[PDB]
């Protein structure tokens, strides 16, 4: 039903800032000096693009400027990523830990504060997600216990699966679960320090496969490998005693209980250069969903998260410039670099205009009708109803801080990294490389 | 399969979600009942699919088929496992293990027993599999205790073994490769294996036994992937039992007149995940099956078994019964659960049958107990036939117990238990606005 | 380890091996070469690299900036001492 056009463009930025501290965000209450800039953080970008009915087109002899609209059609998609390779690492300098359970006979008596410096690697991961609708991240928090008996602190609760949109800055889980280590962990010491202040996420694809619009997902790959290195313990008491059915009470020191909690050790394998999905161009020559290149609002969502170039930088600075070697010479400083760019090739679609397909987009999305004009008057939404909002000689209806004002813009508290490229088009494409790579593909 | 006609009717089904969490190692409960059962990654996954009768739905045309002759049924086309968790393995062990010491890097030799039980946690082997069929599958493990019995038994003899072909119930742990055998029976130490394996039974499927009956009620799809490597080596602690023959060894004096370890124990291990090596969310298409059964839910009913190790993570959270204090090791008490996620995405084809005598003979061959659900099976001579003379011997207070013949066999497996799912309700004609029903067009072309 | 003038950024001259103590490592990009519309610096390229992590090590000296007092739970007595969160990949 769409009108496939004839002319293709391209835009790209030149660079994208991401440099600074991997471990955490040091920020004064007056001002921020550097955010937590880490490789493991989710990297979501949104470009803003212009509108093709806004940009005047001189070769418009195909279509009449009243009976038709115009929308872009994203065709060629390409991820720019150009840093040197290398693994990063984090940890916790104070970890609840008895010993290696693998080669040890029994454990000592838990006294006070066996929290020591252990610093651990993470997994391989590379991914991509492209659309004109934001993606959903699925995480958990503690389920509220139901009021049958009063609970004491120190309990196992159940757990609610929480759907949320994905921000920037939050990190991916490393097989430790999309769970609130803010809420569920309560000691601030059991998981590493990079994540202990927050929670981690993961995208659920099957509910993401459950949309009729197609505008949220049409193209997606993944790699993500991992193995487990070691087996250690926690340090503390156990809220659940293991039963005496399948165990035997011993004698002597064996009557003193050993560790029941075991912890794993997530760990990365060898890296690969060849297996990277970066800088291989992709095209929706055919769609898998309901978005046949029809991105809306001149808006794009991209999220690509990587662990491969994750190396964090070491740098020191002298304090006294001493001659004979001391330990009081150099104060430490830790940063970590990231660098990306985005490269995209497009098409157009001139929309045939009736009220039926004007009723189509409302059945897809009602928000962008605010600028999709057609004549603003005859969407006749009005039908018969009693009254909710429009009878105000007030007397029962009141002071109302919340009810209708915080809801209509959903993404304002969604804090994520942004990109503004509303002028970077290109008519001819022999002067741009990846379109020339397309030019042999088109022939 | 050449007696039915492949129709043109194709629908879609969908289960939305299946939330399931629980403690990994054992089940927590009071004395009464379980609200929080033992859930972990390595339990076998027995399920039941339930489909409604196709004749009771108003199919769009009534002329191409005839209900007075035949009673059509669903037929399967292509299904897949929609696994949905972040990838990761969670491990366990047993806090009191039977062991001398390590044999690999033998620093010094041991002397047996004296109760030095060992806390060692280790990983497992890896599996991935999928298995379907209109009848639930049959697994195996080993048994103990019976012989031809000519000789008496002393304290602690050697028993022979016995293979137990048995059904898989859900919650049964899949083995780490040790042995499909009753650990409650053969492992009397109650200490030697990890904690969820100490009392229960691990089992395993026999695929050639699935290849035995040539119908195919237990198999028409069969895909697999497993990997394996063992890291280091152990002993046990105890007594030798059967001694090694010294007829080829040469003994020695000093401390070496004493016996060393003869019992030698592996420590198996797992390799990394390979996310391209999985088999989930890839649409599977079989135009030609492997048994006589070309994908028919005989019973309007199916059985799927798929066990994961990739998303086998354990999960922790810390909690202090204390309000706040200066930090000791006596502050927090710990709790463990284990997340799970499974969903099913289901495409079928309505298939017509025809009624003939050898047809209704063959249903009595296949499962004779099922035609009573069908309606056009009527016996014109009576089966009750007034042998009891239609219940009038005298009924001398028979009324109280007259109803004790109610009805028998309403379930073939009453004591068998497993988790399942209702699917009487999730159907639609045009699957195109559903996911993967557009991928129906790809394979068809 | 990084694309830097290391002897500038490290005044210790002892936190890296020898051939990077007073030198400066570089690494070729692709994209600026991809950006040029002439290609006198690019017409055919390829690469292959493998790496994994052996160990984790530390550095000793003046401490850095710790967390803002809440993600730490303060140790007791001997455990009051806090050290190198400098996490050395290998």
UniProtKB/TrEMBL annotation, chain A:
The keyword Disulfide bond applies. Pfam families: Late_protein_L1. GO terms for cellular component: T=7 icosahedral viral capsid. Keywords: Capsid protein, Disulfide bond, Host nucleus, Host-virus interaction, Late protein, T=7 icosahedral capsid protein, Viral attachment to host cell, Viral penetration into host cytoplasm, Virion, Virus endocytosis by host, Virus entry into host cell. Its main location: virion. Gene3D superfamilies: Major capsid L1 (late) superfamily, Papillomavirus (2.60.175.20). GO terms for biological process: endocytosis involved in viral entry into host cell; virion attachment to host cell. It is found in: Virion. InterPro entries: Capsid_L1_Papillomavir, Capsid_L1_sf_Papillomavir, dsDNA_vir_gr_I_capsid. GO terms for molecular function: structural molecule activity. The keyword Methyltransferase does not apply. Self-assembles into homopentamers. The capsid has an icosahedral symmetry and consists of 72 capsomers, with each capsomer being a pentamer of L1. Interacts with the minor capsid protein L2; this interaction is necessary for viral genome encapsidation. Belongs to the papillomaviridae L1 protein family. Forms an icosahedral capsid with a T=7 symmetry and a 50 nm diameter. The capsid is composed of 72 pentamers linked to each other by disulfide bonds and associated with L2 proteins. Binds to heparan sulfate proteoglycans on cell surface of basal layer keratinocytes to provide initial virion attachment. This binding mediates a conformational change in the virus capsid that facilitates efficient infection. The virion enters the host cell via endocytosis. During virus trafficking, L1 protein dissociates from the viral DNA and the genomic DNA is released to the host nucleus. This is Major capsid protein L1.
TrEMBL record, chain B:
SUPFAM superfamilies: Group I dsDNA viruses (SSF88648). Signal peptide: none annotated. One of its GO terms (biological process) is virion attachment to host cell. One of its GO terms (cellular component) is T=7 icosahedral viral capsid. Pfam families: Late_protein_L1. Its main location: virion. One of its GO terms (molecular function) is structural molecule activity. Keywords: Capsid protein, Disulfide bond, Host nucleus, Host-virus interaction, Late protein, T=7 icosahedral capsid protein, Viral attachment to host cell, Viral penetration into host cytoplasm, Virion, Virus endocytosis by host, Virus entry into host cell. It comes from the Viruses. It is found in: Virion. Forms an icosahedral capsid with a T=7 symmetry and a 50 nm diameter. The capsid is composed of 72 pentamers linked to each other by disulfide bonds and associated with L2 proteins. Binds to heparan sulfate proteoglycans on cell surface of basal layer keratinocytes to provide initial virion attachment. This binding mediates a conformational change in the virus capsid that facilitates efficient infection. The virion enters the host cell via endocytosis. During virus trafficking, L1 protein dissociates from the viral DNA and the genomic DNA is released to the host nucleus. Self-assembles into homopentamers. The capsid has an icosahedral symmetry and consists of 72 capsomers, with each capsomer being a pentamer of L1. Interacts with the minor capsid protein L2; this interaction is necessary for viral genome encapsidation. Belongs to the papillomaviridae L1 protein family. This is Major capsid protein L1. It comes from Human papillomavirus type 6.
